A paper describes a structure:
However, it has been established for the H1 (1918), H2 (1957) and H3 (1968) pandemic viruses that a change in the binding specificity of the virus membrane glycoprotein, Haemagglutinin (HA), of avian viruses from a preference for α-2,3-linked sialo-saccharides (avian receptor) to a preference for α-2,6-linked sialo-saccharides (human receptor) is a prerequisite for efficient transmission of avian viruses to humans. However, surveillance of human H5 viruses has revealed a number of H5 mutants that show enhanced human receptor binding with HAs that contain other amino acid substitutions in the receptor binding sub-domain. We have carried out structural studies on the HAs of a number of H5 mutants that were isolated from infected humans in Vietnam and Egypt to explain differences in their receptor binding properties. None of the substituted residues in the mutants we have characterised make direct interactions with the receptors; they appear to have their effects by perturbing the biochemical properties of the receptor binding pocket.
The crystal structure of an unbound form of the VN1194 Asn186Lys/Gly143Arg mutant was also determined, but the crystal was unsuitable for ligand soaking experiments. Nevertheless, this structure confirms that the Gly143Arg substitution is 15 Å away from the receptor binding site, and is thus unlikely to affect the binding mode of receptors directly. Its contribution to receptor binding is likely to be electrostatic. For the Asn186Lys/Gly143Arg double mutant, avian receptor binding decreases ~4-fold relative to wild-type in comparison with the ~80-fold decrease in binding by the mutant containing only the Asn186Lys substitution. By contrast the affinity for human receptor of the Asn186Lys/Gly143Arg mutant increases compared with either of the two single mutants; the combined effect gives rise to a ~104-fold gain in human receptor binding avidity compared to the VN1194 wild-type, indicating that both Asn186Lys and Gly143Arg substitutions have a role in improving human receptor binding. Two of the substitutions Gly143Arg and Gln196Arg are distant from bound receptor. They appear to increase avidity for receptor electrostatically by the introduction of positive charge. The double mutants – Ser227Asn/Gln196Arg and Asn186Lys/Gly143Arg identified in human isolates of H5 in Southeast Asia both have mutations (Ser227Asn or Asn186Lys) that compromise avian receptor binding. This characteristic may have been selected during human infections to circumvent virus trapping by mucins in the human respiratory tract that are densely decorated with avian receptors.
Residue numbers in the entry:
A (entry chain A), C (entry chain A), E (entry chain A): 1 to 321
B (entry chain B), D (entry chain B), F (entry chain B): 1 to 160
Write the structure that this text describes.
């Protein structure tokens, strides 16, 4: 009679690596690295993200005529933007401290747009003439919808003196711009005054923009340039403007309504009519696993990322061929 | 490897024994059979479960790298932001690759030690009542029926 | 007769963790993580730090009327500043490249303040009229004590042409400012000249500041703004000034006397009339141990920081219950 | 665990033996007593002291993160400066947690191996002059008085 | 008769360290850390690097009279510059966004210099009078060779209106500058017009530089300053200039011909008439090994760097003394 | 150390045996000689070669830190760029120092286990045909000429 001690074998094909040896077959093994994703952009925690589609953050905020879809958006979970949005600054120019603003809007989850200077309150200037062929809407010359390109009235551009006082409880994102024309004739034609300025001030702001008249390469037909500026206006602070020309006045500002964790993501994906916990630019992750190699940059309840093909722990023992 | 039992003085594994990781094959007049050692198997299961969960749980959390925007005249700080994430995510790539290699080697040795200690459990149990055959088997000097065989597995043979 | 081999046991309650098992009781164990600190700000190596208390770095350097305690400070070990110092820029405005300067003063351990343009040497302007209710001293209108707010004399502000040549061996921190008024009347009332400037130059500096006249929100009663600028003046270099108005002239500059390892720390703590080797914002560390979890940012002979509750090595062996 | 001696073929520890980590209990006509093995204890003390000091000393030094000031329009680089220190100090949090776990496991195994090698030291010393009892004790076939017992501990019994 | 099992010994003196013990002698050991380097700057992959020697990147691009060696350089592998090049801006001044440009030229491996505005095409100004004693060539007053210091002709400086359109396939680095004079007399003496400007524009550029007249410390004899600016001009874009004075016009621009991996290295070394795979500031590495401690910053097929005296693996076993 | 063979029940190494890492010394009527065990030596060579190459190969690649230029008013971000590279290159300095220490300790134990398993290979081979002397030698109860001695080394003595 006989008793033998011994160990488990099976027909497992699973190999792992050690320091001393590689491709060792084992009875059981556990894979820790995730490699799968549904391949779509999905609501975070049951709330739809802000997918700008063909518009940029600038295009959206300024109100490019081609971004009407996002005239009054609801609360968002995270911001998705394409690699090179076609609808950015329809009128050529630049947006001052754009990246810092983009970074600010990552940590916001809802705006409310309010009127702060009615378009119809410009009793001494023309307010409905500032349209351009660079910014078409339905084959018709138009302009960024949230700011107003003021023009002289009766061969006179009186000095603008206006302000808005933030009587609300929330911070206020306020946007304005300055028009840099192509030559002196144009300056006279639009603003009368040859030597103009734009002064803007808050508790902390103190600027005086001077437009710049020059010939430059045409972009969407224009040698002129629009240059845009922003500030956060604090509860109970006021913003003051003064200009004798070239002023792209605000009409609408943004009341910061909901704040929270998010950021801007570069992705060419559409919405997936779907719902998730975790998200990469290439796709959303649904699993229990604790590591992945899909994409560096991420948002959501995301298991950790690393750059590797295969991570596999031995759990069982050396299997006998 | 390190402890000489698996693929050593025990030549091979038992395909036939499926109820556990380590165990017994007996042979007597009533027949021959496979049977797992519950305690030894469940010790190892616990250990290896906790080794796994320790690698997962103690990652709380690694670097959580959410993107930034730099522009055409901030190429230096973009490169800096670039290099930071290279360096980090390539530090974890070293950790994780090597951790898994080192712990894969220990886990196999853990199993080797377990089969060895099981062997020595029974050796000490049977004392001079059986001969070691050197291949992991003991041949009894007396009849060992199923009650006897189960008493070896319980740890209750010759309880004194 | 009998000899047995065996191992130590005791009544140790100390548990540690391993990979395979946790809360294993052992006969001895060594704690490596430090968690204690005396809870006070203490002299580094027997030398008192620069504790600004309610003043900021700007307030101190410019000579805010409320920072008189720090009129002529001794050599310091490190700089402590509160989260939001109440005495900063008493007259509202901004300090140009403030953070870069703050960073510069971290690696300094002693200034010597020298007069470079006597206040009484301004024979063609008024030098003792530039006080403001925004900057009170003992219920009386005053101003930053190290710079001079010049004013017109006899309805005339002649063009200032001055300079200082650094005949010393040390580098020199030099501070000046420009006044941005609220409207044209004020400009005339203070400086006569409507169109003014401030040009400043060294071997490497080349600037021309132009003040900015605008209505803006009142801060400490003022719609005007003071904007301050600095430079390091090298041994044997000279600094040149020219202005026909709005010039906040220097009187005092700082001779960099002692350099060395330090930095600015945000802490609400007072001095502890005490002496130490290592310091965090929350407290000073005195021990032999090699790790801690108290606070990220630190200065002194400080054992290393990590974010963890408990780190404990087994030294003894498994204790038998 | 790995070497089968502590909490294995040696069931428990001796509360009574306080002068060292590993040692002897003897029993003869003159009495019974506990006594440490100096060499074995001091080997281990040295080792474990150097393991500790290696973890401490070779940290020369970790990241020395002294703070910076960024302003309202430098939120990107503030975030960058933020994330850097997250990532780093969370890399050391992984190292240190896991180092301590792995070395805690080795230190226990180190002790297990030590008690095993001590057992085998004496087994080889006594050869056929005593019987192994399988619980860590040897029963002598001849009288072993205190001089004899101390000669086992010295390594001087049957010096040839 | 007898058979014994046993292990290898030799007369190896090689010691290694472990966790438990240090300086353990072993039969074999492998050193992994590299510590050697030929001590010279060498061609990368068989192609010579750009060694500026005593010139800086600015000096080279602008065409400082002392950098004639690098008038028309061939394709380079990497850029070497001394700690403090003696030939930088011979005429004192600054180079706008210098570091960003330096960083741009790291990832380039060949320029081709083209004429874009012939020096002899300035029919209404003087183009050959702009030389300075600050910029000597063979004891003779000269100037940066790639830009042109224009001067008034017949007591008149007409408004310059020029442009260049990038008809090439490659991007174009274009350089211009503005002269900041010492006083009004000089302004009249050189440019006639008291109030001058320089406007420059592309698809994306839009600037208007205004010179700054001031007394400042003399550097190489000059209280005046030259300030230089650059842009990348895209294929099919044009650059426009307009000025009534103080304009340092371009003549030559750089066509980006070869792009690729490289960067600027600070080293005092000369060329070694040699050829290598890997390079540090102190020397080039030739070996099979996988780690080193020579120098942090590197380029080429370089095994990894770390800060440590000795790294040595045990391969053999404990050797018996 | 951990496995008790090297510098334990085998007191010392053989200077005379140069053809391999582990092996045999025999002694009989025809003479005495050293001879390596090929298999055991070549197992270890493979292992240790792969341990080395694993430390080298899996570094693919560490941080590749190519320099940047910051100016007189960008001292904060220069410091940031500074501190990043401190922190990183000092993380690898910890990894590498400690990796080498831990694997140096395992490699010695690997060798100790190897000499032990070789000893037990032969013990099981010879069964009751020789006496263990406790110093790593077996004394045969019968004549063992060179053909016999080589048959022990082949693994072919008493092949059944
Ligand atoms: C415009 O100004 C002119 C001055 O020439 C004035 O006479 C005229 O009445 C104004 N026109 C309108 C339409 O109000
Ligand atoms: C440059 O020249 C081409 C003609 O060769 C023209 O089509 C293009 O529009 C020009 N670019 C600009 C910005 O005017
Ligand atoms: C001030 O200037 C006036 C010119 O109206 C001159 O006559 C007068 O004497 C000056 N006043 C003083 C106090 O010097
Ligand atoms: C804004 O309005 C409130 C009155 O509602 C006033 O008290 C406050 O001072 C105003 N803010 C400014 C900057 O004038
Ligand atoms: C320069 O301008 C003057 C005007 O005084 C003109 O008469 C003269 O002919 C011009 N000189 C030359 C050399 O062309
Ligand atoms: C400063 O003064 C010294 C004379 O003491 C002089 O040699 C030096 O050039 C002066 N510096 C400047 C910038 O003028
Ligand atoms: C493991 O490595 C082996 C031999 O080096 C190689 O043949 C194979 O590609 C690897 N395993 C698998 C499944 O590919
Ligand atoms: C184990 O087996 C014995 C002998 O066959 C049996 O009587 C008993 O039920 C079992 N005892 C335990 C403790 O499991
Ligand atoms: C260790 O973990 C145990 C069981 O998981 C838990 O009860 C306990 O909280 C831990 N130890 C201590 C002292 O808290
Ligand atoms: C150890 O004990 C022996 C025998 O009792 C005693 O004679 C001697 O003094 C000791 N020898 C050594 C080397 O410690
Ligand atoms: C190793 O350390 C020993 C003792 O701590 C010391 O004497 C020696 O300097 C080290 N080895 C060498 C070769 O220097
Ligand atoms: C090993 O040795 C035996 C006995 O001396 C010899 O006959 C044979 O050639 C060898 N066999 C093998 C398999 O190496």
């Amino acid at each position: 009679d006989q008793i033998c001690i011994g160990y488990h074998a099976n027909n497992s094909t699973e190999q792992v690596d050690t320091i001393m040896e590689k491709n060792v077959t084992v009875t059981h093994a556990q894979d820790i690295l995730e490699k799968t994703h549904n391949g779509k952009l999905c609501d975070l925690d049951g709330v739809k993200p802000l997918i700008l589609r063909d518009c940029s953050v600038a295009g959206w905020l300024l109100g490019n005529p081609m971004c009407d879809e996002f005239i009054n958006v609801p609360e968002w979970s995270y911001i998705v933007e394409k690699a090179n949005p076609v609808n950015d600054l329809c009128y050529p120019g630049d947006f001052n401290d754009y990246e810092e603003l983009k970074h600010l809007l990552s940590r916001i989850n809802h705006f409310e747009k309010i009127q702060i200077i009615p378009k119809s309150s410009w009793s001494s200037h023309e307010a409905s003439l500032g349209v351009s062929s660079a910014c078409p809407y339905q084959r018709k010359s138009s302009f960024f919808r949230n700011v107003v390109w003021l023009i002289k009235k009766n061969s006179t551009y009186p000095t603008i003196k206006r302000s808005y006082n933030n009587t609300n409880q929330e911070d206020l994102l306020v946007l304005w711009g300055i028009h840099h024309p192509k030559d002196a004739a144009e300056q006279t034609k639009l603003y009368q005054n040859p030597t103009t300025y734009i002064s803007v001030g808050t508790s902390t702001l103190n600027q005086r923009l001077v437009p710049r008249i020059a010939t430059r390469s045409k972009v969407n037909g224009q040698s002129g340039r629009m240059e845009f500026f922003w500030t956060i206006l604090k509860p109970n602070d006021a913003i003051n403007f003064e200009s004798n020309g070239n002023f792209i006045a605000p009409e609408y500002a943004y009341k910061i309504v909901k704040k929270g964790d998010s950021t801007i993501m570069k992705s060419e994906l559409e919405y997936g009519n779907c719902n998730t916990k975790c998200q990469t630019p290439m796709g959303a992750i649904n699993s229990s696993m604790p590591f992945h190699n899909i994409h560096p940059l991420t948002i959501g309840e995301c298991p950790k990322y690393v750059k590797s093909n295969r991570l596999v722990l031995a759990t069982g023992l050396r299997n006998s061929p | 490897g390190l402890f000489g039992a698996i693929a050593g003085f025990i030549e091979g594994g038992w395909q036939g024994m499926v109820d556990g990781w380590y165990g017994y094959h007996h042979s007597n007049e009533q027949g021959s059979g496979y049977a797992a050692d519950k305690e030894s198997t469940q010790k190892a299961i616990d250990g290896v479960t906790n080794k796994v969960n320790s690698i997962i749980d103690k990652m709380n959390t690694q670097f959580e790298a959410v993107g930034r925007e730099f522009n055409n005249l901030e190429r230096r700080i973009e490169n800096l932001n670039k290099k930071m994430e290279d360096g980090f995510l390539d530090v974890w790539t070293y950790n994780a690759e090597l951790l898994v290699l080192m712990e894969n080697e220990r886990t196999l040795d853990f199993h080797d030690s377990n089969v060895k200690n099981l062997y020595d459990k029974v050796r000490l149990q049977l004392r001079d009542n059986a001969k070691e055959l050197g291949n992991g088997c003991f041949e009894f000097y007396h009849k060992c029926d199923n009650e006897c065989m189960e008493s070896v597995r319980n740890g209750t043979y010759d309880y004194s």
